Structure 1
């Protein structure tokens, strides 16, 4: 394509005079643009994405974090560039109780890490998800599903973190995406359980490899504050699992009243595009910043930029 290169981008940095922010992907660009525009609707900041920077090295051709780290190393010092890389599972300790070695936004010479596993983990306050699912969700019994969520989310985030951590252990990122389905979840007195279906596209060996680690982890992840759990989950898998859980709640609410409407609502939202859910959550999170106290944001990055 007609993207830049690392050297060309360093040259662009020295040439240009604007304030720049270098993020890992294209979704973070949209969300951070929303944040910046909220805090100052007339902002001359540009958010560039490492995804649109070509690297000759084959290793760097798909690792955007290495790209950001390289550009930061080669341009350390310049005062009109800021970097934002995701935290993955760095500085996270899994000894018994899941613990965060660094409890603040890591900052090292204009490079800023995300508070959780990624930008999508700021969205994981109960208030943000509960508010942002109404705007898009139809109503088989809307308020009922919202109320059932309001409680089930307490253990839901623990379970979702367990799923993400188990996937990380088995070195299969996308496994939770397809293995788990909306009909899979089970609700019991505001308790989420993940029954094991029979047929699965991946070899039954993969199914076992996941489920064993998941079962091993669950006690480990049920003994730390829900905040750490919300921090240790992954972005895309977390969003998809939350979609599935709201679908399951829809079914649980609607099963008693009408089978057809409940099935329609659940199977519908289970197909809603991930971009729509992420955009709605970003709108809710930006619109619900500061007014609450449990809703976080990259304050240090915003202070460093502008």
Structure 2
């Protein structure tokens, strides 16, 4: 491909006099560009992505964080460049209850970590999820679906965190994305219970191990604080899980008026692209900054650059 290597990018840092920022993915670049352009639409900050830097090593080829650590180590002490990575499950304690050992943005010589599991964990504020789902909806029974979702969202975060922890225990992070479907979800009095469906395309051993891990991890997540709980959910897992949970609640609360219309709306919402959901959440997250005190953003990173 046509991209810089680690050494070529380091030489570019020597040649360029711009203020630069290095992030993991392109989605982080687009979201941070919107965030920067909100405060300063004429800002001249250039945001680079470690995803678009070629690596000779096969293992280092798709490890964006290792690229960032290598580049940061070799230019350690520069003033004009900042680095951003994803915290993942680092600095989190799983001693029967979810504990955040940092509770703030990490900073180590222009290297920063997201407060949550990834950048998308900033979207997990309830107002942002509401605004985004309301804006991207079939516009048939949106108000009642949003009201029900707003009721479910308080306890659903424990379920989402339990799903993410069950995924990371067996190292199958992408397993709930294709295993769990919105029809399996049941809407209770503020909670949900993903019944173990008898029929699955994947082998029963993986399904059984996933539900055993989920059952063994759910009470530990329940006893934890809600605010800490909303940050450990995996970003990619969380986007799809919220899309299905909203498709399920929409069909659950809209079937009495018209079962066929509710099923069509639920299938339409479930078939929505991940990029559309992430972009809508990012725009809503940008809009809620400064209006609500409960919306966070990498203030230290923006201040530093």
Q: Secondary structure at the match of 1:84?
A: strand
Count of matched residue pairs: 305
TM-score (norm 2): 0.99
Deviations 1:232-265 (A, max 9, x none): 0011110100000100111111122210111011
Distance in 2 separating the partners of 1:107 and 1:206:
38
Q: Is the 8 A contact 1:185 1:192 kept in 2?
A: yes
Distance in 2 separating the partners of 1:189 and 1:210:
25
Distance in 1 separating the partners of 2:139 and 2:96:
41
Deviations 1:79-109 (A, max 9, x none): 1100000001000000011101111111001
Distance in 2 separating the partners of 1:140 and 1:37:
34
Distance in 1 separating the partners of 2:157 and 2:97:
15
Deviations 1:14-43 (A, max 9, x none): 110111110001110100000000011111
Q: Is the 8 A contact 1:240 1:274 kept in 2?
A: yes
Q: Secondary structure at the match of 1:70?
A: helix
Q: Is the 8 A contact 1:140 1:250 kept in 2?
A: no
**Cα displacement (A) at 1:134:** 1.1
Which contiguous aligned blocks of 4+ residues in structure 1 show a shift greater than 3 angstroms? none
**Cα displacement (A) at 1:140:** 2.9
Distance in 2 separating the partners of 1:158 and 1:300:
29
Distance in 1 separating the partners of 2:279 and 2:213:
32
Distance in 1 separating the partners of 2:39 and 2:230:
25
**Cα displacement (A) at 1:201:** 2.4
Distance in 1 separating the partners of 2:12 and 2:201:
46
**Cα displacement (A) at 1:202:** 2.0
Q: Is the 8 A contact 2:185 2:193 kept in 1?
A: yes
Q: Is the 8 A contact 2:156 2:190 kept in 1?
A: no
Q: Is the 8 A contact 1:126 1:150 kept in 2?
A: yes
Structure 2 residue ranges without an equivalent (≥5): none
Distance in 2 separating the partners of 1:128 and 1:224:
23
Q: Secondary structure at the match of 1:252?
A: helix
Q: Secondary structure at the match of 2:186?
A: strand
Q: Is the 8 A contact 1:254 1:262 kept in 2?
A: yes
Deviations 1:138-161 (A, max 9, x none): 123110000001110011111111
Q: Is the 8 A contact 1:179 1:200 kept in 2?
A: yes
Q: Is the 8 A contact 2:20 2:46 kept in 1?
A: yes
Give the superposed CA RMSD.
0.8
